[PDB]
């Protein structure tokens, strides 16, 4: 019967909550209160990229810290040269409702997808001088929301059908399927060692998954609304999330408990994207208020404002070596700060 | 740009910048429309007359040398809250209602109320189509079904003076048709503050005149938008 199973689930949840509460020892703010603050950070716009027609939805930095790819609501993919402000490639898309884009670590392939329920792979290094599509990954029910490369033959995609999957470009089949979320998944993040990954959904919860095992290992809660973006800490034991209630949190994998909260009373809008610096000292988050706030990851103090966009910031990105930071917006303009 | 390779790269970038100018012109001349409905509503029949886990459908039609692009949502989950914000710049939204079943009309009114009050759907006008009108006529002449059994306010209703019953076959049919229309009309006029409008219409099984109606509605919608910006309205 369903009567005893619900009580058993409730008492397991109560036991888990009690164990987590007993695990709590002290707040990170108390430990960090005896460190001098970073100060005032003042970045300025160094480059401006123009050429996009419709709204910009996503972007991804390259591993060489010089090239990047961006997606537009009109169905175009453009590869930019950050130093000389030149355009390298311009790939038209079959479907204009693209929502995400990814860049391969080796620099040989790019990926994109959207409401078409299809993830496409484009080959950049061909004998003939033209970008052509290699494979289309079909099988999802909802819309594609995020995608990240693991190597030249493995990719992880997030879809709106509340399920994640691991694909294989060589065979075009779903190697592994991840289930458990009740709401649709909006974003995912990968670890530097590519052994584990996390994702967030509209059920105000985040889960940690194992690539080979294909099973969930840990769950995080605490947000009052849906999850919009997720970023993963450089160490490999922490990650940060962003929601629509003007609130961001930091979670610890080993401690299994929420860290301090980054929020302000003057913000009523929602977070769209989050990122970390090279050393993990500064946290950058886009908002609906046309600005990009900069926070201190250790003292929870806001130090720096990145203003200059005419519409909402839809995506963010920090380069591999930390030289610069790139922002995208619905005004079809990309700005590089330093 | 001192090196010859840099000059060639600059020339390639200029070439790329010039094919992105042709696209602009084509985009600035098109109009995008969003099609919404339900399983019972014959939107598929309408879009077929106008002419795998697929995500979105696209249909193209032209009238008076003007191109319209319409997007129909395919296989998707029952939740539409998240992806509805990507259509906040379309010309108009077409809604199809099946006026043949009972409490499915109630579901249609609930869906219309939900869509009308959406925050991300502001400054967007809605075109309303009342489909399958012949079934409504055939379902009242034979009796065996009463609207008053589901809507108790049907008895306290009468045909309005401004009504124009072009067929005029039976007063009861006109009364029911105008009651059903006025329900959606009152829902639409319950709010809006003049920023957007509703254009209801009566659609038949084939009705090979909906393109002209959509063209006229779109023309009317853009003229008011331009008159508001230059303070004449």
């Amino acid at each position, epitope marked *: 019967e369903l009567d005893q199973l619900r009580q058993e689930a409730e008492q397991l949840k109560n036991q888990i909550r009690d164990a987590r509460k007993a695990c709590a020892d002290a707040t990170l703010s108390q430990i960090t209160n005896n460190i001098d603050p970073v100060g005032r950070i003042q970045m300025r716009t160094r480059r401006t990229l123009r050429g996009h027609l419709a709204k910009i939805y996503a972007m991804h930095w390259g591993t060489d810290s010089r090239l990047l790819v961006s997606a537009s609501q009109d169905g175009k993919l453009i590869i930019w040269d950050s130093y000389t402000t030149n355009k*390298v490639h311009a790939i038209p898309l079959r479907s204009s409702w693209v929502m995400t884009c990814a860049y391969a670590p080796s620099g040989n392939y790019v990926a994109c997808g959207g409401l078409d329920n299809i993830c496409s792979i484009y080959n950049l290094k061909t*004998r*003939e*001088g*033209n970008v052509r599509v290699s494979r289309e990954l079909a099988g999802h029910t909802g819309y594609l929301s995020c995608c990240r490369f693991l190597d030249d033959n493995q990719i992880v995609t997030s879809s709106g059908d509340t399920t994640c999957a691991l694909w294989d470009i060589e065979t075009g089949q779903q190697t592994t399927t991840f289930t458990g979320h009740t709401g649709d998944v909006m974003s995912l993040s990968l670890a530097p060692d590519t052994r584990l990954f996390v994702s967030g959904a509209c059920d105000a919860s985040a889960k940690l998954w194992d690539v080979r095992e294909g099973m969930c290992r840990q769950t995080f809660t605490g947000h009052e609304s849906d999850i919009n973006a997720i970023c993963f800490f450089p160490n490999g034991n922490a990650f940060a999330t962003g929601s629509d209630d003007a609130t961001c949190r930091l979670f610890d994998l080993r401690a299994d408990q929420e860290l301090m909260t980054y929020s302000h009373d003057n913000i009523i809008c929602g977070i769209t994207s989050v990122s970390f610096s090279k050393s993990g000292r500064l946290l950058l988050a886009g908002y609906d208020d046309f600005n990009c706030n900069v926070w201190d990851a250790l003292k929870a103090d806001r130090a720096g404002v990145l203003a200059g966009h005419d519409n909402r910031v839809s995506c963010l990105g920090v380069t591999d070596d930390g030289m610069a930071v790139a922002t995208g917006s619905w005004d079809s303009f990309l700005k590089i700060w330093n | 740009t001192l*090196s010859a390779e840099d000059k060639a*790269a600059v020339e390639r970038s*200029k*070439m790329i910048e010039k094919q992105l100018q042709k696209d602009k012109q084509v985009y600035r001349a098109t109009h995008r429309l969003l099609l919404l409905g339900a399983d019972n509503s014959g939107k598929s029949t309408i879009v077929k007359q106008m002419r795998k886990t697929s995500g979105i459908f696209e249909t193209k039609f032209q009238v008076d040398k003007v191109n319209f692009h319409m997007f129909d949502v395919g296989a998707q989950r029952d939740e539409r809250r998240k992806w509805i914000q990507c259509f906040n710049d379309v010309t108009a939204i077409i809604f199809v209602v099946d006026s043949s079943d009972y409490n499915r009309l109630q579901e249609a009114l609930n869906d219309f109320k939900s869509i009308w009050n959406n925050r991300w759907l502001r400054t967007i006008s809605v075109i309303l189509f009342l489909n399958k009108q012949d079934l409504l006529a055939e379902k009242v002449l034979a009796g065996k079904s009463k609207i008053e059994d589901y809507f108790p306010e049907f008895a306290r209703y009468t045909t309005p003076e401004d009504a124009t019953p072009e067929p005029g076959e039976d007063p009861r049919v006109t009364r029911a048709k105008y009651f059903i229309r006025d329900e959606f009309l009152r829902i639409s006029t319950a709010s809006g503050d003049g920023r957007h409008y509703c254009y209801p219409h009566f659609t038949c099984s084939v009705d090979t005149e909906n393109a002209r109606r959509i063209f006229n509605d779109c023309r009317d919608i853009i003229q008011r938008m331009h008159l508001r910006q230059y303070e004449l309205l």
Partner: single-chain antibody
């Protein structure tokens, strides 16, 4: 991916002929084209060049008012016009594809060549100290190249190229920008330099390494070639 050339023959002095190079198997409209001349018993020499957009055209200082180049994107065919042929205008001609962007590898594929026989300053000087050397099938081989000016640019690139034309076939590409290896070249060739003197190192050796190695630079676009060193096994 194959290039075919047509024309050639023996003509009287003062004549005129039109040379063509036909492309097939790739997007010919996005690659620049060069003409390279090679005497029967001498090295290579550049002739002319047309960019992808036909907005930039260069000519060799040897002949500028007698040679005309043209291209046709729709049918993917290159053209070369020669007027008032002289005694010196007798050599082998090749058409070379090239594309310029970040990370690109220009001068990657060459044509077959057509023969044409005629009856009887401020540019960087590139020289090669050696011309022939016998080696052992399995030991190391070192080839040195010299320049009269620093090839290093302010950005940080060193424009040096290695071709190694085989004795009986068209040239190839081994090292571009003095440090990067090509696609189909086995991972046994390497190159290094300091800014004025450069060396080419081959770890292993096989029967297919027999040929003449050429030296070329692309700094300020004089396009001057080297002398060439022949290897015999």
């Amino acid at each position: 991916v194959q290039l075919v050339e047509s024309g050639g023959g023996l003509v009287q002095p003062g004549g005129s002929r039109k040379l063509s190079c036909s492309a097939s198997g790739f997007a010919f409209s996005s690659f620049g084209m060069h003409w390279v001349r090679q005497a029967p018993e001498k090295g290579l020499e550049w002739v002319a060049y047309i960019s992808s957009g036909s907005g930039t055209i260069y000519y060799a200082d040897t002949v500028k008012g007698r040679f005309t180049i043209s291209r046709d994107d729709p049918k993917n065919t290159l053209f070369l016009q020669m007027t008032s042929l002289r005694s010196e205008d007798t050599a082998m001609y090749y058409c070379v594809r090239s594309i310029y962007y970040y990370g690109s590898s220009p001068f990657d594929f060459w044509g077959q060549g057509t023969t044409l026989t005629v009856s009887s300053s401020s540019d960087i000087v590139m020289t090669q100290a050696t011309s022939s050397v016998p080696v052992t099938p399995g030991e190391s081989v070192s080839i040195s190249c010299r320049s009269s000016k620093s090839l290093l640019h302010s950005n940080g690139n060193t424009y040096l190229y290695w071709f190694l034309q085989r004795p009986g076939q068209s040239p190839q590409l081994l090292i571009y920008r003095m440090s990067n290896l090509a696609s189909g070249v086995p991972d046994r060739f390497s190159g290094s330099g300091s800014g004025t003197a450069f060396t080419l190192t081959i770890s292993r050796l096989e029967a297919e390494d027999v040929g003449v190695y050429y030296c070329m630079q692309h700094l300020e676009y004089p396009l001057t070639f080297g002398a060439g060193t022949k290897l015999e096994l």
